Design an enzyme around this catalytic site. Structure first.
Site, mmCIF file in Angstrom:
data_model
loop_
_atom_site.group_PDB
_atom_site.id
_atom_site.type_symbol
_atom_site.label_atom_id
_atom_site.label_comp_id
_atom_site.label_asym_id
_atom_site.label_seq_id
_atom_site.Cartn_x
_atom_site.Cartn_y
_atom_site.Cartn_z
ATOM 1 C CD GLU A 209 -2.724 -4.704 5.815
ATOM 2 O OE1 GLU A 209 -3.182 -3.680 6.348
ATOM 3 O OE2 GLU A 209 -1.660 -4.730 5.149
ATOM 4 C CD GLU B 282 -1.767 -2.030 0.328
ATOM 5 O OE1 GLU B 282 -1.339 -3.182 0.184
ATOM 6 O OE2 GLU B 282 -2.304 -1.371 -0.553
HETATM 7 O O1 LIG Z 1 -1.504 -4.471 9.676
HETATM 8 C C1 LIG Z 1 -0.892 -3.340 10.205
HETATM 9 C C2 LIG Z 1 -0.657 -2.231 9.258
HETATM 10 O O2 LIG Z 1 -1.872 -1.566 8.883
HETATM 11 C C3 LIG Z 1 -1.790 -1.248 7.475
HETATM 12 O O3 LIG Z 1 -2.208 0.012 7.212
HETATM 13 C C4 LIG Z 1 -0.382 -1.587 7.095
HETATM 14 O O4 LIG Z 1 -0.212 -2.041 5.779
HETATM 15 C C5 LIG Z 1 0.015 -2.622 7.998
HETATM 16 O O5 LIG Z 1 1.444 -2.712 8.107
#
Ligand SMILES: OC[C@@H]1O[C@@H](O)[C@H](O)[C@H]1O
Ligand SMILES: OC[C@@H]1O[C@@H](O)[C@H](O)[C@H]1O
Ligand SMILES: OC[C@@H]1O[C@@H](O)[C@H](O)[C@H]1O
Lengths: 496, 496, 496
Positions: free
Chosen positions: B291, B172
């Site tokens: 995520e 990201e």
């Molecule tokens: O999962 C934790 C963090 O939250 C996201 O925004 C990041 O990609 C990740 O490193």
């Protein structure tokens, strides 16, 4: 059945540059490994180079060879192939899904170019590398000594700089087959900045910018226009590529394809001149036709290799075996380059050894023999130095499948004021009728008439013997050359 | 009061890819150090892996773990973590202002993943690095031998290649908190060229291209459209990220946020198909939700830590302690993932150990226990294999503070034809009334009714016991499955 | 004839940031080699530094020195100036076609700065290097220890960090003379991204984003506007560059060009103020005039050395021999600088040693004299700290050949609370008539009236003696101070 020509000392086109008789060796297939380089072999010198291939290269009087790519260079790391041979990595060649062991590097290949009387035209990686690594290698090759990368070249066993004269800014990164493919704007920007920096180490070099991969790429000719718009003040040539094929088994049409090549050249020249006016430069960009040949035979039997037997060292890739009709196109292509020697000052038959080559060795040990296309190249390179005189021609006309108004006879005259000869190359693309060639030599005696002809257009050569070789054959009066050219034949005419 | 659905095998959405029950381990906080890796701990092992936490993740039946990032990847030099542990450097992790000692690198983690019965999903640094280094890593992990980076893995003590299947093109980079932030065109080009290079080294990998950091970025979803526009032909998934939090103490609304998750998924699916139209491609991009979690509790003490206590090894960052109401939303999200098993084929609960995670280890040698969210995930990954049936549903509605017409029951029936079972996942988002779920099971014997309830929404688990845990409880005629779903409850009902 | 000005402690403008009295050492010509560093000379201390030049720098009260460039930095690799001097490589400096022995590196020049009582303003390479290499150099200099690049500085013999306070994101990359030239949007993005990651390593640095190379670049000030639009949140200054010359040999129009410098500065402030509105920011960007001086003399002899004596170490490049009128423009420039102390917080006389400098050493040995320009820079640096008071001046006017309405008398007042001095800096650009400056001080005894005049505008200094030097000459009742300012004179009048 009549075709007349005017040739005229007083009517130039340009003086031929000998680097249109250049060639090209890529780290592809067997071009190097069991090609020009075969160490323990009974036919190879102490350095490991085959002496019989060295001879065949020398009969082609090649003054300049492009190296090392080709798609290969786009992920090459030139450092890998220099220094102690013990310390050189095996690397994946993503281009030709084989493994590169890197026994032949800059210094080894620079030696083989001595032994065949040729200068290197070096290609820098602008695919996965950029400005500073093009600088380093330029420093290694061209700077005399006293700096990190010059001394490194001395320490490696080469005390004098290779002093490489012409460089290619990467290799045809507009194709989707290409590691580190770039857009017009990305490449134009990087070619410019790399040209600017390299010319700061060695202002005596010349740099070629990459044109389109082929005239059929959707981005041609806007790629050229753009690239040149960025880097005009820092480069000397634009490059062009063209390969032809006869998978359509349409000899008549296939021999008409040198007309596409004429239109291609005229289009790139237009683009150049256009950008010129845009810049109001007094300079002209020249053309580096650093990739041309016939290439269609081994198409299917390269797909099998990559990948079902992939990551081989030195697989037999691109091993086209050329027919008679093929050499007819080569001659037609040579003739078409010679008609354009006023803006084409560098050309490369692709490639030199084994890989779509005029020379070939047999697999796994050797032999060495001349392909059909060796001889038209040879005649061109030998009698085609001097001055080019305009093709003031009327000849019959014929149409083919996908080509209309095709001249039955392409031909040009090269006048060497030094040797007081005038050599006339001529090809008869009429596969059927025989046509005779009047020639109004408003000169100022006939010297010989070499010819290459055959009955079977699909005839190949082989290790086992040559079906195609210059048979001095044939037959000039007042100052009027009268010569007959058989259906589908290559012809060199000579006068003293 | 009465909520009705009909459940019919002959009405499918898709087959569940078990990879939607995957997770994620970043080099963040105590996720590695003082988490899965504690070298001299009594509970630990030959390789420093806590064996109690190895068993806990086995319980979760996680088949695929993204590694090592996460924002951490965008400035990670993968060579710092391979080879002789003594030679590995200490690096500033700019992302989470920690110090990375690189005691666990690729091979360490790679053999923790066998131990917990999972495979790496590898992320390559495309923040401060690019094409060449992605190729180097891919070759190291997947090419067998006889090349610089594969022999290097072999010399490193891993003789067999890791053969990593799914690779994520960066992380990201759309956010301003990312080192190496890219614009969409910038990233789209480097993702396209890295995808094309990697697939030349190993055609069997699958590649995932980075989507927006969250749906609330102003570049959503134009980012996903631009990236896919460039990289469509060389990548197989587009990634999606989503997190939810209840920092407004409004439980009724907080559990309707899985509706917003559905809306979000449909937008990425639509963006995909639009670009599919553009490209005239017969291929489908699949969704990688790599995520997702609840994440809001520790927002503050994270800010206290960085940067007041910066550059520590293994700070206690991002340690949310999860509520029962949180475990309700996680279950509501899994059901929502399920309801989209046709386009979503990889998903990752962020994250696995200690960092917003269903498994905690206490500190300085810690303890190990299951948070509330451990359990809905365990019920999904265990009983959630097979085929997803279209949720034909009419249940009551209710508005909330910020959401209108929000269902009271959220269920999805999924059918395993070899097990001859059908599991109904069902959640009562009405935190006041109780609801009866009459499920017409178009024939087709009830097996159990697992349940996750509590009177105290804001109740937690801890090392000193589990307030939320599966209570086999409850409470099928002809072919009507009647079961009572308590207010604010998670239900897994099985027939067989 | 007469000219009225009134000071007033009440009419303020800004506190002087002592960093407007900064300077600049590039690895250019004889600034380092055969300049400040001569390791076997009889006048060079333990490290190699000419102690006479150290005492001469200490006279100029230079707080801040930019280093290493300048065009040199755009291809510099800072790793080549650290570690064992035996292992440091010699490098092509493409900027000035010189060899760089790299015997003076970061750590060496940091020691020289302790000895001159100064600090480094460090330029990172952003022409052929990027984010991760500026990140390494900032970790080398500013991180205390326990990470790869800070431990490495320790291993190199500097246990405590240099803690460099302001950093320069590359160098003037809009010219076609610079290696690695970038466009507006290229530099704008490389600058935004480099700043963003550096500030994650060390939040207490300030960063300078490059402006145009000159006010005459076509791209001015769209460059400035675009770069700030990318980088606003992470940079702190926009740089300015201006040099002057008298090749036209028009003395009175040459003393006028400081009006152009004022206009220059106002355009940049307008541009920053425009982007500020666009961003709706509450932050002002500040001006860092880190290249300014007179430069025109050696333009003949500089081309004669490249490329005809190329690749020398330490050639005599840019060795301008300053006349007296030159010192006068330099004096006005410093007034125009001080007059803008509300937005200019950093300024560098370019350059410090031998290269267009106020201090020169004779070559192949030593000497060390003061160029005419040494003296106005000295007075400003010594008497010009405190609060710049708003100048109200009715002064007479005059035309020149290419400037209209040019102040006869340019003046400005600095007031030091810690000495209740009110030093006044004034100059008479009327090379013909003499003018007297009444100064109505609403203070607040007279202290001195240092003066700098000479009747031959073209008179130089030399090793053989300074013809231009401060004379305590001249020629204050109760309210009014009255001071006669000879034609073509620089005056520093004091009060106490
Ligand atoms: O999962 C934790 C963090 O939250 C996201 O925004 C990041 O990609 C990740 O490193
Ligand atoms: O010359 C053979 C290959 O054809 C072209 O596509 C490439 O430039 C070259 O490597
Ligand atoms: O005087 C400084 C030099 O000249 C300028 O043009 C360059 O920035 C610098 O290298």
């Amino acid at each position: 059945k009549k075709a007349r020509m005017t040739v005229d000392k007083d009517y130039k086109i340009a003086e031929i540059d000998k680097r249109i008789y250049g060639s090209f060796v890529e780290h592809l297939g067997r071009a190097v490994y069991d090609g020009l380089y075969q160490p323990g072999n009974s036919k190879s010198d102490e350095d490991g180079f085959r002496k019989d291939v060295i001879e065949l290269v020398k009969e082609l009087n090649v003054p300049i060879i492009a190296y090392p790519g080709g798609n290969f260079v786009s992920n090459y790391f030139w450092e890998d192939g220099v220094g102690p041979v013990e310390d050189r990595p095996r690397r994946l060649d993503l281009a030709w899904k084989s493994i590169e062991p890197n026994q032949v590097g800059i210094n080894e290949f620079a030696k083989w170019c001595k032994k065949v009387n040729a200068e290197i035209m070096m290609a820098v990686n602008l695919g996965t590398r950029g400005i500073s690594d093009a600088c380093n290698l330029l420093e290694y090759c061209n700077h005399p000594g006293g700096s990190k990368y010059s001394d490194m070249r001395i320490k490696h066993g080469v005390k004098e700089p290779h002093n490489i004269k012409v460089w290619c800014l990467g290799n045809e990164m507009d194709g989707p087959w290409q590691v580190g493919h770039k857009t017009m704007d990305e490449y134009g920007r990087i070619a410019e900045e790399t040209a600017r920096a390299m010319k700061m180490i060695d202002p005596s070099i010349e740099l070629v910018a990459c044109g389109s991969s082929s005239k059929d790429m959707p981005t041609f000719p806007q790629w050229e226009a753009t690239v040149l718009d960025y880097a005009y003040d820092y480069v000397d040539y634009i490059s062009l590529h063209q390969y032809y094929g006869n998978k359509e088994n349409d000899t008549a049409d296939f021999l008409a394809k040198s007309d596409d090549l004429d239109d291609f050249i005229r289009s790139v020249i237009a683009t150049c001149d256009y950008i010129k006016a845009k810049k109001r430069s007094k300079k002209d960009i020249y053309l580096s036709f650093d990739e041309w040949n016939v290439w269609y035979h081994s198409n299917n039997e390269d797909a099998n290799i990559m990948q079902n037997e992939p990551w081989r060292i030195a697989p037999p890739l691109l091993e086209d075996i050329y027919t008679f009709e093929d050499a007819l196109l080569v001659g037609l292509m040579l003739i078409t380059l010679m008609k354009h020697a006023d803006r084409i000052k560098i050309a490369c038959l692709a490639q030199l050894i084994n890989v779509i080559a005029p020379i070939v060795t047999e697999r796994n040990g050797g032999a060495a023999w001349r392909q059909t296309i060796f001889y038209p190249f040879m005649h061109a390179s030998k009698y085609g130095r001097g001055i080019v005189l305009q093709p003031v021609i009327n000849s019959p006309l014929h149409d083919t499948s996908k080509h209309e108004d095709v001249t039955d006879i392409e031909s040009v005259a090269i006048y060497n004021e030094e040797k007081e000869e005038v050599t006339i190359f001529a090809v008869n693309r009429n596969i059927h009728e025989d046509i005779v060639l009047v020639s109004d030599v408003r000169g100022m005696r006939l010297l010989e008439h070499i010819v290459l002809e055959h009955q079977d257009l699909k005839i190949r050569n082989s290790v086992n013997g040559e079906e195609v070789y210059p048979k001095n054959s044939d037959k000039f009066d007042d100052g009027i050359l009268t010569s007959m050219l058989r259906r589908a034949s290559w012809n060199v005419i000579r006068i003293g």
